[PDB]
Amino acid sequence: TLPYLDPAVPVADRVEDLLARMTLPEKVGQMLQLDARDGVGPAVLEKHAGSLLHTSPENVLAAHELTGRTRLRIPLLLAEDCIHGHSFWVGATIFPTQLGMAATWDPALVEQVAHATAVEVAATGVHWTFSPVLCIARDLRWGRVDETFGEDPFLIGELASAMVRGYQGDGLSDPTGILATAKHFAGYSETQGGRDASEADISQRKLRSWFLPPFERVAREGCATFMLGYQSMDGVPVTVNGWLLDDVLRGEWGYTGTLVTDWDNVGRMVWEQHIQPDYVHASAAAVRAGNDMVMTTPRFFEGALEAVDRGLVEEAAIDAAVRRILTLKFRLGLFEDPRRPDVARQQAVIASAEHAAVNLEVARRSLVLLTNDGTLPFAGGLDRADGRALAPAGAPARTIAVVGPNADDDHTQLGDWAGASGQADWLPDGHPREMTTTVLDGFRALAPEGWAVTHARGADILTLAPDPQVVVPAAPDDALIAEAVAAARDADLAVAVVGDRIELVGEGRSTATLELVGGQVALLDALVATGTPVVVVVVASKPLVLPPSAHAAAAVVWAANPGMRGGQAVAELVLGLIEPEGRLPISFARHAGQQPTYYNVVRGQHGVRYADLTQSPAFAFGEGLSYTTVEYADLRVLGTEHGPDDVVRAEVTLTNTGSRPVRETVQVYVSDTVTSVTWAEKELKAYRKVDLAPGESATVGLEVPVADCTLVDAHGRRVVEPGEFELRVGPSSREDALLRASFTVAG
Amino acid sequence: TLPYLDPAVPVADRVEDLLARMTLPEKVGQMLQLDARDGVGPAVLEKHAGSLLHTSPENVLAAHELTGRTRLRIPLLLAEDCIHGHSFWVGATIFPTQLGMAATWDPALVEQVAHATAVEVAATGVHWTFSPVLCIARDLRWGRVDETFGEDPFLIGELASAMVRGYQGDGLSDPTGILATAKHFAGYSETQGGRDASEADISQRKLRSWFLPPFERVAREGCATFMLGYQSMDGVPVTVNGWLLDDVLRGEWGYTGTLVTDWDNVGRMVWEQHIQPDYVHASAAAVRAGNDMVMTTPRFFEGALEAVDRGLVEEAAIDAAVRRILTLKFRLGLFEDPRRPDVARQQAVIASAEHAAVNLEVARRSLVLLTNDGTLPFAGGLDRAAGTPDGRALAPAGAPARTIAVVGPNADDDHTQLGDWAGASGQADWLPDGHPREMTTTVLDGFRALAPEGWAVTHARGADILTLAPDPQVVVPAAPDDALIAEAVAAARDADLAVAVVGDRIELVGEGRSTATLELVGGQVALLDALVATGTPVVVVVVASKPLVLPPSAHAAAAVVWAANPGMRGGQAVAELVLGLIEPEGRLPISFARHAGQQPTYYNVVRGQHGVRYADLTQSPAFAFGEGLSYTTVEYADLRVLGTEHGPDDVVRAEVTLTNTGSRPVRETVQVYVSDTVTSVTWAEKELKAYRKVDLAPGESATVGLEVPVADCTLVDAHGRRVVEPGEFELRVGPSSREDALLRASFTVAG
Ligand SMILES: [Ca+2]
Ligand SMILES: [Ca+2]
């Protein structure tokens, strides 16, 4: 032989030969992506599904057998949330979350993470990951901040670009490449209240200004699929948003990839957004809008068939979507090799030493040292003879008390979209306890022979009660507090590991207050009051408001969810076996009502502060300490006048005036002095990592293409306007940390 | 003539004759509305100003003298912020803030307020007030929530319509009518962070949906002027926003009134929004956009002139603005009679008994009882001596001696009680000592005057709110004060009732003064905790600009009264309410959040959210739009829609039955919400469309008719059109916007 089965026949002819043989239910079936947890049998055989997601290892094997019993034997696309590692394969390598990864400011490293993930994913027979996430974290109340690369469009684009390259490899014939997904297109991350898929009050120009740029980048770089957002934007759900899908994605960007909806997008237009009277009309709307894959709306099957039968849409529209789906399957070679799981390759590559080394590198470089009174590195810093550290000169016996609810919690350390986080039902125990080094594990393994490591839980966070169940913050626990206070009073250092956990994170779980829940604030107050130096380690999904006692503690480390090696990286940082390198990809609010606290705030406000609160963030985008001092000086623009096709070139001089080496992340912001429409005060446009030995000075070149110095004007065009600009260069987005030099652009 | 001085000549010909006589500097100056506090001499003589604002009584007189010395003697328009009463005339009747007035749900009363204001304003020689405020209070962080009529577009339109009607009177020849102003057109109230004039991230459709309806109403009803907002909206400041000004205001609505910017709108485009390189280009851009009056951008004078000289804009563009301004002045009769202040008129009408009586009625009907465990009315409620509707209350049966301890920073603060835009609030510089003390009854005053002869009223401050420190200065919350709390605790332990009067004050309110936390600042939380723990029943009275987060102790107190800023008679109303001398009638025009991060907390939330709560916090507001108690129980029953067919020109008619099942009379406010069941684009869960006040004697039942025109059952569709879409609707009727309080009945609009 049949021509669609002949690999010598051109793809377009194979597609036409198969399409002409399909019944309409078989064609509608190809548009369906169904939840395999509900039973692969009916999905493959009765609904003729084109794709499955959340397919357990036993159901992947069953799905291939079922395909063999179908009339046309069209291979399935098996898709999965493989979000920061192969989230739902027991024993896979689980990396930090994207938010954690973004603190490395290292696209080359993030590409290694994505490539390592795809290698593991491919060995399990999954073809397609719903990753990377390109949402921009502009309201910290949102439950899914942990899934973003932070608050900056340029850095998001850098790191999402790296993920797509790493996942897709050499292309559709690469055996270790998988399809990437640009999600969640677009505007999902900034909706009313920071709630999950509440209304997006985002105009066309606002979306173009702060949300689209990373999506346009990965579209142009060949991201195989896009996922359409759950949310209504200016009253129109993305699933039927013609401006966004046709004018922007297909038209302005010329995108030729394949679309998939988010979970039950089509159905939600009936029962949650209340914009369609029934499933037939919602199905017709989704077809008319140009959707391809419809994720987990089972009733699209009968709804689209009735819509065609009633003349609401043409069978030709179904054909157009199936043509695109079949083209993808043919180009992946799935009719010749359906890419079944391979046990021998799973044993060779899943959680390989290779992959664990990448994971350790990301964990080590993601930790952000936010405050330090000199207590760190502890006892002046330690040396090794990998392996246990030696007691340093002048500190033969020390005791480190490791306390707090997140100090020994391996599930919470890995975060959402991993293990037992809840979206997959075949990982009851999550990932093997084996594979995660908690903070307590890390200190127990690295503290010198001669030092002691003690543990006390100190505080609980929450319990669940009936109304899904609702969170009940843990009560005061004087006995639990007093046990941790006793450990600290008998210690030289108290390492308090605090944060959030899964019931306070993710879909349907935005938070209003951003505060530590349960007994954690009381624990931190009591610990600091002992006079033993306290290091607060925040293991949490997103930036939290920390209590006054955390700001009075000796040091504060931000770890996001640092993955399987995170606990080793934490102990190494505290003990000085590594230098800190992480830099914040996101700003920390002092109060939920303080927002916006992202750095790229649009100008115009009457005043600089709330009457009851500063507008200065607790910690700002790009901030983060090392164990040395670095002086920035002598920022110069080399030729200040520019035409549109030129490059802004600059130099700055850095000096390591301290005693330890550093990898410094130089950050380059552009400010547009006079804008035709109101605009951000500044935006990150470039950055550079610079290694500096103690006492070393270096003059490093910097550049920003003039073409990147854009704004979105009143006509919705992203343009460089002639006029004055400032280049702002320094170690963070804090204005008092930035050198500045003027430049101009002329027509 | 000369023809422009000839009253027999038609207005259009008078305008043309005068325009032809004017130099270009005098035409540009006629567009200027300058701050009289900086000197009326230069403003009138050197800059040929067409208008002044913030003009002190002495400067009003001097301004008329200076006008007679100018070449053409063009009379000035004198304008003022007369925001709730004649704000900055010492001894005027100061009413509750607009937000307090809105709790009455009484447009007829609000019209009386505005007409009484206008009478007093006209006597002082001011022609034009920058009122009413039509902003919608959708972010409680915003500092200017006190100036709004709350969070609901329909109720805002109702009350703003009333204000414009009362202000303007019989029209441009009415000696007691003044020009009203629809401010701040539009979207100013919902900007990033709830900050003052930060960026408004508002699409055309969102603006049409929730912000424009009150403005469209008063535009069609003849509001003489509109004021352009300070904010940049989708990147474009309102001052140069062609879609809003040309397509909507002048185009869709056909509005023919006069425009004025807000304060230094044009200059801010240079120094604060950074969208114009210099003042000549900002001036040109303001002129091109069709601006009329330019408020407090003095450099517009030289800016516009240089813009004309460089051909950036045509002198004909200046001519067009001057024609509209001069036409207004001619139709006001200002060339015949410039409406000078009149001292005899001032003595006769300002703070008259009739105006004081309107004020007391608004104060009484505006208070909102939010919680009551039975403690109120105190001691079972009191009566006055028969035939004495004004004297002390009589001690009741079984309670010969009771002591009421009045405590808290706002218990005896007559300035904070009047609120922003009044007295010494700060925008005027000629009344450093505020309005006369005798005109304001504080909460302490009210209890002292009304408590029975054998009862006692004690006072203790209990808590301070703030002090100011050098960097304007910054707010420093008042530190813990154990001794002050102990004094108030001792007073409460030695009393039968503690009335704790808490809230905010001027440094936490208004322009440049949004708040992040919405909490009570200073020692107030500590005071409330300590008071409730005494065992003496505590009534919390909130005198504040806007809804605040109240601590758990306030929710454990015996009763909570919301007073907003209740004006000069507010303290009498509070005492009368607590003692049962009046029944509570107020109903919230705005919802109260439990935390700033809980917002949106307005009732008309757009559908679509995955989930119902935050993981750490309910989404239920502390108190919801429309809530408010009386001193009796009212059962709602048997909601019925009348008829089956409802077409585009029909009225949906319905009936509901109310029964007063308790022991005291009530004026109940029945609220009528419409819910559009299936919508072409996502929409609010429900919207208020009607209400009705019903008086019920004890035990009385009434079947009450309700109606909503089908043409009011609109949404704004994907094409930016406000339309009624055929399909199913739900009518929801009850005593508040709480879903568990609403009866509901379906209806269908045909088509
Ligand atoms: Ca510029
Ligand atoms: Ca409808």
Q: How many A from CA of B89 to the centre of ligand 2?
A: 51
Q: How many CB atoms lie within 10 A of CB A464?
A: 10
Establish if B530 belongs to a structural domain.
Answer: yes
Ligand nearest to the CA of B676: 2
Sheet bearing B634-642, strands edge to edge: B634-642, B651-660, B701-709
**Phi/psi of residue B734, each to 5°?**
180, -175
Resolution of the experimental model, in Å, one decimal: 2.0
Separation CA B231–CA A606 (nearest Å): 9
Separation CA A258–CA A328 (nearest Å): 8
CA A734 to chain centre: 24
On whether the CB atoms of residues B125 and B60 are closer than 8 A, the answer is: yes
Please name the member of A197, A235, A723 whose beta carbon is closest to the beta carbon of B718: A235
Q: How many A from CA of B200 to the centre of ligand 1?
A: 21
Establish if A130 belongs to a structural domain.
Answer: no
Helix (H, G, I), strand (E, B) or coil at A650: strand
- Find residue A80's DSSP bridge partners: A129
Same domain, B403 and B540: yes
On whether the CB atoms of residues B285 and B269 are closer than 8 A, the answer is: yes
Q: How many A from CA of A723 to the centre of ligand 1?
A: 5
- Find residue A619's DSSP bridge partners: A588
Give the closest residue to B90 by CA, choosing from B52, B120, B129.
B120
Residue type, B751: G
Separation CA A59–CA A65 (nearest Å): 10
Choose one of B220, B249, B278: the last residue of a domain: B249
Q: Tell me the angle at which helices A300-309 and A315-331 cross, rounded to the nearest 10 degrees.
A: 130
Where residue B521 sits, what CATH number does that domain have?
3.40.50.1700
The pair of structure tokens assigned to A289 is 């809008």
The pair of structure tokens assigned to B189 is 């109230």
Ligand nearest to the CA of B747: 2
- Interface probe with B: pick from A146, A510, A511, A744, most Cβ of B within 10 Å: A510
On whether the CB atoms of residues B677 and B728 are closer than 8 A, the answer is: yes
CB atoms A611 and B514 under 8 Å = yes
**Phi/psi of residue B144, each to 5°?**
-105, 20
Distance from A236 to chain B by nearest Cα, in Å?
6
Same domain, A436 and A574: yes
Establish if B611 belongs to a structural domain.
Answer: no
Separation CA B295–CA B53 (nearest Å): 9
CB atoms B718 and A603 under 8 Å = no
CB atoms A206 and B201 under 8 Å = yes
User: What are the chain B neighbours of A713 within 8 Å (beta carbons)?
Assistant: 235
On whether the CB atoms of residues B300 and B294 are closer than 8 A, the answer is: yes
Cis preceding linkage at A132, omega within 30: yes
Separation CA B115–CA B135 (nearest Å): 21
Q: How many A from CA of A59 to the centre of ligand 1?
A: 58
Same domain, B440 and B516: yes
Separation CA B159–CA B587 (nearest Å): 14
Separation CA B687–CA B732 (nearest Å): 9
CB atoms B203 and A199 under 8 Å = no
β-bridge pairing A294-295 and A368-372: unpaired
Residue type, B300: F
Separation CA B417–CA B423 (nearest Å): 11
CB atoms A607 and B513 under 8 Å = yes
Determine the residue of chain A that is closest to B198 in CA distance. A605
- Interface probe with A: pick from B514, B601, B603, most Cβ of A within 10 Å: B514
Q: How many CB atoms lie within 10 A of CB B561?
A: 26
Ligand nearest to the CA of A726: 1
On whether the CB atoms of residues B716 and B205 are closer than 8 A, the answer is: yes
Ligand nearest to the CA of B728: 2
- Interface probe with B: pick from A190, A461, A462, A605, most Cβ of B within 10 Å: A605
Give residues with Cβ within 8 angstroms of B202, minimum separation 6. A201, A203, B187, B190, B211, B233, B234
Of the CA atoms within 13 Å of residue B502, those in its CB half-sphere come to 30
Distance from B495 to chain A by nearest Cα, in Å?
34
**Alpha-carbon dihedral A18, A23, A24, A30, rounded to 10 degrees:** -50
**Alpha-carbon dihedral B410, B412, B414, B417, rounded to 10 degrees:** 30
Separation CA A119–CA A456 (nearest Å): 39
Separation CA B644–CA B667 (nearest Å): 31
Determine the residue of chain A that is closest to B272 in CA distance. A604
Residue type, B652: V
Choose one of B249, B277, B307: the last residue of a domain: B249
DSSP symbol at A287: H
On whether the CB atoms of residues B607 and A272 are closer than 8 A, the answer is: yes
Same domain, A721 and A642: yes
CA A422 to chain centre: 18
Same domain, A562 and A647: no
Distance from B587 to chain A by nearest Cα, in Å?
25
Please name the member of B475, B600, B607 whose beta carbon is closest to the beta carbon of A611: B475
Cis preceding linkage at A355, omega within 30: no
B71-75 LR contacts (CB < 8 Å, sep 24+): B71/B26, B72/B18, B72/B21, B72/B22, B72/B26, B74/B18, B74/B26, B74/B30, B74/B48, B74/B50, B74/B326, B74/B329, B75/B329, B75/B334, B75/B335, B75/B338
Ligand nearest to the CA of B274: 1
> H helices of A371-477, where?
410-414, 439-446
CB atoms A235 and B609 under 8 Å = no
DSSP symbol at B41: H
The pair of structure tokens assigned to B113 is 């307020």
DSSP string of A307-342, one letter each residue:
HHHTTSS-HHHHHHHHHHHHHHHHHTTTTT------
Distance from A565 to chain B by nearest Cα, in Å?
28
Dihedral (CA of A409, A410, A413, A419) sign: negative
CB atoms B205 and A235 under 8 Å = yes
- Dmax over CA atoms of chain A, in Å, equals 85
Distance from A235 to chain B by nearest Cα, in Å?
5
Distance from B336 to chain A by nearest Cα, in Å?
41
User: What are the chain A neighbours of B272 within 8 Å (beta carbons)?
Assistant: 603-604, 606
Establish if A132 belongs to a structural domain.
Answer: no
Of the CA atoms within 13 Å of residue B203, those in its CB half-sphere come to 20
SS3 content of chain A, % helix, strand, coil (to 5): 35, 20, 45
Where residue B694 sits, what CATH number does that domain have?
2.60.40.10
- How many helices (H) and strands (E) chain A has is answered by 22, 29
Q: Vertex B655, ends B653 and B660: CA angle to 5°?
A: 150
**Phi/psi of residue B416, each to 5°?**
-55, -30
Give the closest residue to A739 by CA, choosing from A639, A731, A730.
A730
Same domain, A663 and A576: no
SS (H, E, C) A665-681: EEEEEEEECCCCCCCEC
Q: Vertex B101, ends B100 and B103: CA angle to 5°?
A: 70
Size of interface A-B (CB pairs under 8 A): 228
Establish if A657 belongs to a structural domain.
Answer: yes
Q: Tell me the angle at which helices B279-288 and B315-331 cross, rounded to the nearest 10 degrees.
A: 60
Same domain, B569 and B717: no
Give residues with Cβ within 8 angstroms of B8, minimum separation 6. none
User: What are the chain B neighbours of A280 within 8 Å (beta carbons)?
Assistant: none
On whether the CB atoms of residues A459 and A480 are closer than 8 A, the answer is: yes
β-bridge pairing A258-261 and A225-228: parallel
Separation CA B696–CA B689 (nearest Å): 23
Dihedral (CA of A208, A211, A214, A220) sign: negative
Query: Which residues constitute the domain of residue B89?
Result: 81-249
CB atoms A232 and B681 under 8 Å = yes
Residue for token digits 């007035």?
A: B101
DSSP string of A246-284, one letter each residue:
IIIIIIIS---SEEEE-TTHHHHHHHTS---SSHHHHHH
Helix (H, G, I), strand (E, B) or coil at A626: coil
- Interface probe with A: pick from B682, B716, B722, most Cβ of A within 10 Å: B682
Give the closest residue to B476 by CA, choosing from B452, B504, B507, B497.
B507
CB atoms B609 and A196 under 8 Å = yes
Q: How many A from CA of A736 to the centre of ligand 1?
A: 23
- Find residue B734's DSSP bridge partners: B671
Separation CA A709–CA A325 (nearest Å): 38
- Find residue B51's DSSP bridge partners: B33, B77
Separation CA B212–CA B720 (nearest Å): 12
Determine the residue of chain A that is closest to B241 in CA distance. A714
Distance from B34 to chain A by nearest Cα, in Å?
20
Separation CA B353–CA B358 (nearest Å): 9
Separation CA B192–CA A453 (nearest Å): 48
**Phi/psi of residue B297, each to 5°?**
-120, 80
β-bridge pairing B727-734 and B743-749: antiparallel
Give residues with Cβ within 8 angstroms of A628, minimum separation 6. A579, A656, A657, A658, A659, A660, A661, A662, A692, A694
Distance from B269 to chain A by nearest Cα, in Å?
9
User: What are the chain A neighbours of B605 within 8 Å (beta carbons)?
Assistant: 192
Cα separation of the two ends of chain A = 62
Establish if A30 belongs to a structural domain.
Answer: no
Cis preceding linkage at B610, omega within 30: no
Give the closest residue to B72 by CA, choosing from B49, B38, B97, B96.
B49
Total length of chain A = 747
Same domain, A386 and A532: yes
Q: How many CB atoms lie within 10 A of CB A255?
A: 22
Where residue B223 sits, what CATH number does that domain have?
3.20.20.300
DSSP string of A164-229, one letter each residue:
HHHHHTT-TT-TT--B-EEEEETTTTS-GGG-SS--B---HHHHHHHTHHHHHHHHHTT-SEEEE-
> H helices of A447-589, where?
478-489, 520-528, 548-552, 566-575
Same domain, A508 and A654: no
The pair of structure tokens assigned to A538 is 């925040």
Establish if A550 belongs to a structural domain.
Answer: yes
Report in angstroms the alpha-carbon separations of B344 from A678, B60, B122, B176, B362: 51, 16, 12, 15, 27
- Find residue B35's DSSP bridge partners: B53
Same domain, A417 and A490: yes
Helical (H) or strand (E) element with B414: helix B414-418
Dihedral (CA of B271, B273, B276, B282) sign: negative
CB atoms B610 and A230 under 8 Å = yes
Q: How many CB atoms lie within 10 A of CB A198?
A: 23
Give residues with Cβ within 8 angstroms of B732, minimum separation 6. B672, B673, B674, B675, B686, B739, B742, B743, B744
Establish if A651 belongs to a structural domain.
Answer: yes
Give residues with Cβ within 8 angstroms of B311, minimum separation 6. none
Same domain, A577 and A695: no
Separation CA A280–CA A595 (nearest Å): 42
Cis preceding linkage at B436, omega within 30: no
Helix (H, G, I), strand (E, B) or coil at B484: helix
Choose one of A552, A586, A620: the last residue of a domain: A586
User: What are the chain A neighbours of B512 within 8 Å (beta carbons)?
Assistant: 606-607
Beta strands in B306-414, from DSSP E residues, in sequence order: 368-372, 383-384, 393-394, 403-407
Give the closest residue to A665 by CA, choosing from A365, A401, A288, A420.
A365
Q: How many A from CA of B677 to the centre of ligand 2?
A: 5
Give the closest residue to B604 by CA, choosing from B516, B707, B682.
B682
Residue for token digits 């010749």?
A: A336
Please name the member of B197, B205, B516 whose beta carbon is closest to the beta carbon of A610: B516
Same domain, B574 and B668: no
Residue for token digits 């040929």?
A: B48
Q: Tell me the angle at which helices B107-123 and B153-168 cross, rounded to the nearest 10 degrees.
A: 40
Separation CA B376–CA B559 (nearest Å): 7
On whether the CB atoms of residues B589 and B103 are closer than 8 A, the answer is: yes
Separation CA B329–CA B326 (nearest Å): 5
Give the closest residue to B147 by CA, choosing from B82, B225, B55, B238.
B82
On whether the CB atoms of residues B507 and B550 are closer than 8 A, the answer is: no
Q: How many A from CA of B590 to the centre of ligand 2?
A: 26
Domain count, chain B: 3
Give the closest residue to B693 by CA, choosing from B667, B658, B661.
B667
Residue for token digits 């043989």?
A: A21
On whether the CB atoms of residues B98 and B166 are closer than 8 A, the answer is: no
Beta strands in B113-154, from DSSP E residues, in sequence order: 128-129
On whether the CB atoms of residues A300 and A286 are closer than 8 A, the answer is: yes
User: What are the chain B neighbours of A518 within 8 Å (beta carbons)?
Assistant: none
Please name the member of B198, B615, B682 whose beta carbon is closest to the beta carbon of A199: B682
Separation CA A295–CA A54 (nearest Å): 11
Distance from B506 to chain A by nearest Cα, in Å?
10
Q: How many A from CA of B347 to the centre of ligand 2?
A: 57
Helix (H, G, I), strand (E, B) or coil at B492: helix
Distance from A682 to chain B by nearest Cα, in Å?
13
User: What are the chain B neighbours of A473 within 8 Å (beta carbons)?
Assistant: 616
Q: Is A372 buried (19+), middle (13-18) or exposed (0-12) by CB count in 10 A? A: middle
Ligand nearest to the CA of A720: 1
Q: How many CB atoms lie within 10 A of CB A2?
A: 10
Burial B439-454 (b: 16+ CB within 10 A, else e): bbbbbbbbbbbbbbee
Report in angstroms the alpha-carbon separations of B452 from B385, B404, B540: 10, 11, 22
Q: How many A from CA of B744 to the centre of ligand 2?
A: 16
On whether the CB atoms of residues A138 and A103 are closer than 8 A, the answer is: no
Give the closest residue to B577 by CA, choosing from B505, B629, B503, B634.
B629
Q: How many A from CA of B665 to the centre of ligand 1?
A: 66
